[PDB]
Amino acid sequence: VSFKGGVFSPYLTTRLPAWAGVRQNVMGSN
Amino acid sequence: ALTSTPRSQLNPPNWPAAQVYQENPAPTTVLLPRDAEAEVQMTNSGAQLAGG
């Protein structure tokens, strides 16, 4: 199901919902 | 004495606004091409008026 030769976001992009960690996968707090 | 407006001093320094040749032109009747009310209603309806 590769998306090569693929556009780059063929899909409606929805709200970054302003929460706390639906923002990325990373490290963090003190 | 038949082509000169009776003056009070030859070469008067400020010809007033009455004894100088004002030019009145006929009023400029313009045919406003379009009625905006109907055009806006039609364009709102979905039409896409385009042309002369």
Partner: protein, 48 residues
């Protein structure tokens, strides 16, 4: 829709069978006026 998997990238194609009428009038010698329309998928509305 469904589709048999084709490894070569492919894109759909859909039509909505919409009236595309047009009316063309000429009021004066050398002037042409047109009205475009698309009843279910109008090409222009109150926002333009």
């Amino acid at each position: 829709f469904e589709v048999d998997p084709m490894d070569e990238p492919t894109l759909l194609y859909v039509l909505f069978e919409v009236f595309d009428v047009v009316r063309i009038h000429q009021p004066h010698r050398g002037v042409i006026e047109a009205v475009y329309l698309r009843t279910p998928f109008s090409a222009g509305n109150a926002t333009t």
